[PDB]
Amino acid sequence: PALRQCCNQLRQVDRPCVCPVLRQAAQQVLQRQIIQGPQQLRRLFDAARNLPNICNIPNIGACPFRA
């Protein structure tokens, strides 16, 4: 399970580093994968931004980092 493992890892990083590491994870997918267009790029970053909530990380909401 990708999500499960993802949340396990995200819970080990310092809370103030949660969004910065997710921004880097998003950039890695953008760089390493073929991102077809504007729509896919949007979904990629939406997915990354929402992980703190999807993973139920205490006091951290969706990361407002830019695409």
Binding site: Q9, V13, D14, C17, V21, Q24, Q28, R43, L44, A47
Partner: peptide, 26 residues
């Protein structure tokens, strides 16, 4: 640093797979 933790946790490869699937599907 944050960039360091990213690298030391396999660049959050599991998160990358999840993000990539969401980008391709939905």
């Amino acid at each position: 640093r944050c960039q360091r933790q990213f690298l030391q946790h396999q660049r959050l490869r599991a998160c990358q797979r999840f993000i990539h699937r969401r980008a391709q599907f939905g």
